[model samples]
Target: APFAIRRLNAADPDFGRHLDHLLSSVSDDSVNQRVLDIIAAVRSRGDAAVVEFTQRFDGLQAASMADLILPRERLELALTRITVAQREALEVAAERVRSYHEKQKQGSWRYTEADGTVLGQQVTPLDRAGLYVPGGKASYPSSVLMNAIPAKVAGVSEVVMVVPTPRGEINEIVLAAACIAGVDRVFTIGGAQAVAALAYGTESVPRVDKIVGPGNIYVATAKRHVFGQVGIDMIAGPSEILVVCDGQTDPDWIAMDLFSQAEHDEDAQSILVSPDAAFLDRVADSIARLLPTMERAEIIRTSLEGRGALIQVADQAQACAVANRIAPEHLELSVADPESWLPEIRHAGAIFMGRYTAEALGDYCAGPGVYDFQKRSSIINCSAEGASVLGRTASVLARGESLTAHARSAEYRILDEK
Candidate 1:
């Protein structure tokens, strides 16, 4: 059967709803206040507070402060168990990550002016970075590598990872990745407490210059709360993905990609907007068929039925417009001449194209760097607190020097300086 294609426009009224529903359905900030209290306690109490929180949240109570820190030998033992194939994969991914970030490295530059003025932004890596990897049910060493390698590549002094250890012991594979990535440290802590440990530091854990990676609401809120005192990456929302598919693509592959996003968690959002109504129905049906086969079928079903959707756009133009409006963390363009349409993408954390480029590939081995300590350490400011501070900090510094040059650098650095 053949299907028709149409274009969607921004002026459509429900366009707003299509965007809002996906955004609102995926947000998980309700734990902000509670995380604040937990972080406050951890900040004040240090290891003891972390122990208490660990016992309550992760069911693992450290005997003493030392138990919280994962040892070097343990990391070695963990690495030994990973299959040769997995190690080869890690090595390849690490190389890709390293090469990517090596390209992104910004060297310092300075230009001398005729007026004897010298100005330039110096590029320096942070002293240390802490990666918070969620543990238990979903342990992702790839995330550990993703969060740490970049910082390493940036030439960071140290890169440490703090992941919840349900058994009071770090996952050998995760520890192995850290060892392979040359992470400076690994700690058995997570949630708000882990974030606090990373941000403020405890007697057992040294403070880090910045914290990165993804976690639950408590961890996200903790990152949100600690923005001013230290550096942080984006306060990530639930995993989200938007796919702009044409009927020419395989429904099974499309369904799998949607499932991949949905399986991130129940709160995760997976949206597909297509001009072909028949294609949408086929994809939805494919999802339904695949849902029962997965181990996390219940989770996938709930996310698909309650949070997922198949949006109908009049045409590919409308589809791109809808995808852009969502500004999702992950986006896929399944249009003809995908590169030609690349300029249309305005806001997305990452983009995938063509029939072969899977979004999952980026999560593991693509984008910034594969395995670099420096890339992980350097903070990519995305939170409101960081954004606001950058805005004000730029203003304050710009006025102090009154380089007229520096003032000119800012939009409102001066309103007629006396």
Candidate 2:
């Protein structure tokens, strides 16, 4: 059978169902069970389990728990080890990410009412946050900057990083990025065990107020298991990119853009929507031509062949409809005037406007970054007059619900009815 390019048209009657099918994903029970077991072991056994799992799963044995902990000096040493360009790149990315998130830092604000009631919101950062950076074959230095910078900007006192050093192969870039991001601690541990440590708090690994960053299925599953015990950033699914182009951008660029997400993994989805049917074909050809040159060619091909699509919509308006339906992790508006189509987009994790704006940039540099690390708490202070009014209202509602104690409590605050 020939390589199938799943083609969807907005006008088709079954298009809705087809789109749903394309977006639908299923979880693996075996992986979930395995992750559950890992979490349980870590929670019960603590550092002992973490060390054991790290040795068994990663094939790297640590003589003691101390061996798994990377001192701040080590992280700083990594900063010096990388090339000047690498150092400069990490520095610039950290600066940009920090600068962007600084604006997102909300201050405490309250408004006084006529009755002297103060009502507003109090914003604060977590006491500590855990960042799970994937190691081994896939090391993301950028993830350190993206995740840690936001938490630091939000005034998180401590940022704990957990990265698996499989077979003792530590990527200096990751540590260097951590140094720039102001990660307070870096632990050489990962997988569900790391999540468990961060969530439950081992003797060695301090508990975090929240956990953020990307990981494999086990890590995601662990995050789900321990959600209430500690907060987590969204349980990230496989990487996805939806490109809505006016068929004006170069096909090669479009194809490479699609490839960028597809190269993440076989499960990652890459979809392109354009009005010009000929342009779709041109992009398809470009994918075939450029894919061979990619270092991760096999992964890209698997991802594209399995989940990618080149969709032809009726027009740019229809393209927006299709893109909104996907609600992709990354959406690229590759067009002449992306702003004109912006209002139509209702849902997306991040949006990259203009043909020149690659979705990859949003993942790294887009400021006012994801707000998963911090928390917002509402503030309410009632004056005597305000309390009297509110108490009366609450008393009626409480009495109607047949709670005399609640009614009496409110009645006591009624202030003798003037």
Candidate 3:
């Protein structure tokens, strides 16, 4: 079913321009300064930095830095409060994530060529990985599976979870996730200081080789600041959605889908592309009507006013072109045949097909996960990989290719060489 996009009398014919504007870069010195200050403080003071930042930013005093650790008893208590349905969902989702990543698990295999040359990839799990789950504002149990299960499937020895405790305690659902996903360690920490502790070791938190997960702008900035010092999944951007719909589908569904992304934050981007001017108007009315009903309606209203718009394209091809330029975190194809248009899409963190596949599904279950931070330059492309593309690259070179001892551990069999 084709989706509906509002028609406009003065809307730019170049939908690509409107799309580009919606996905524009978000840069603020205040965010960067806070991140830099936090990073510097943490580097000098370790976990002690978390206390200072928390008190200053969160406006609350934690008794001691050790209070940041989620108590084992609380983690257990969280289990009792959680619903069976939620637990079942976690189990099902974790298995799906695990099953997909298991196929991606790299294996170490060596083969000897005719010239006594031996070459093969050495596949082994990372020692430890840190996953920063967003807490305080939203609860995403799915992120727990997406982040933790993949690490476990990759055979990572230790998985440390750092979730910002809101109101002096970790959220119950997140703790339940810790149990379901087998997160090795859980910390009630957040923001740049958390990133620093994960990147650089603190007395309480063990340093991790890599860190992954989505967070607020401050949290994202910290990860980017420490890029070379440690590994990161991606420098994500604010949530975004671009819907390319014709006049065939319901405008309300398209509007509501866009609203979902808008509700994420005031900076979130939402757009609809279509040739039908009348239908475009309907979508706008839908937005106006639906905004009042949502709990985050004010946030969604500001988002739509600031970053959302309707683009009137000349044709479906133009709409598709618009979608590519934005490279949105989530792109919805409200077109007649989304599969036929799929090849036309060159960029986009994730693609949501048809009205049935809402952008929310991409957040919950989809091929590509949405990015959580803005990109400053064109070089910043989406790094949210599915199962097949997760591969290791770039290793140190060892000299003297002919020696069996040299190849034994890396690529060759010494006994076979003899």
Candidate 4:
């Protein structure tokens, strides 16, 4: 069956309503109540709760949490277990990801003031961070490369990762990626239960300063609940891509470009907006022809038909205007003079500026993170002579605010002058 994928005319009276409908996502409250129960059980029973849930949920018949943990030898052994082709690809991708992240790495600084006071921010990585990588159907070694490499780049002391293993079946490639990414420990745990163990600390699972990654409703919902308890990465929504193409590029290429995000899952969105009406029909024709060729054809078909759109924009300016309105997760300005429209676009998670720059390059070989995994401290050291003159100024301000203790404290640091 061919798709009657929603085609919208910018001039349509009800276009805005349809556009908003495509972008909206919902979260149910029942999950929160459910995750809260998962959190409380792990918080109280400790290792027992984690072990119980792992067996019940992941279908792994393990007697204790000890069986769930993987040693460094186990992770490194996976490097040898995988095929030559996969290992080489994982290595190349990891090296590129690691190289890019070094630029994102940061350090501390301090400066001495005229009176000998030293001040500046001291930046350092968190002591420990827990990374959550989805397993079973969600398992992808590239995700391991994307998530764990940045923490290592920041020089975090310990980076622990939690990946679920359904029926105790470990994905060797995922483990191989972790070894390359510099993860310190690996645990077979995931879902809200994993978040709870990392946040609250079970007897078997050590508490981490930060917990980061993409996960299901239970994982994301748990991250929100544990916000103040520990650090968290973004609760990312489903993937999205919006491509604004001029008529010049091959229609088949554009159809494939849209399929990249569409194949992520049924909820993922892929859209193409163009001024060329005939070009739109050509791309639509290309979509109809090519849709059956993909491995995830049904998933791609469901996504393209449900949330996907081929919109008729009046002109180039209108295309960019639509992009800004949606602020897609990935934006591809596949046109002639792709750079010229750069200024026109102010929002987008990541921009692919030319017809040649495919989003696949950004996902597999490039882009992302830092900041969230690091902590900052303010360094201040005041000299004795500096405090004396400073004390008078501080005293006046403290008195202005009517705090006698604050005024007296500064005076105590003051020096006696001849």
Q: Write the per-residue lDDT of candidate 4 for residues 368-390, one digit (tens) a residue.
A: 37677789998777888778888
TM-score of every prediction relative to native? 0.79, 0.87, 0.81, 0.87
Off by over 4 Å in 3: 1-21, 114-116, 366-418
lDDT of 2: 0.85
TM-score of 3: 0.81
Tens-place lDDT per residue, model 2, 252-337, is 99988988888777677999999998998889778877888899888888887778888888987888888877888788989999
The CA lDDT of each predicted structure is 0.73, 0.85, 0.72, 0.86
Count the clashes in each prediction: 24, 0, 10, 0
- Residue 310 of model 2 has an lDDT of 87
Better of 2 and 4 by lDDT: 4
Between candidates 3 and 4, the one scoring higher on TM-score is 4
Candidate 4: worst 10 consecutive residues by lDDT? 360-369
Q: lDDT tens digits, residues 15-85, model 3? A: 44544455563476888997898888898997678777766666667877877776556666877788998
Candidate 1 residues lying further than 4 Å off, grouped into runs, are 1-19, 25-29, 99-125, 137-139, 167-170, 366-418
Distance (Å) between predicted and true CA of 1, model 3? Answer: 33
Ranking by TM-score: 4, 2, 3, 1
| Model 1 lowest lDDT segment of ten | 1-10
Error of 1 at 151 (Å): 2.8
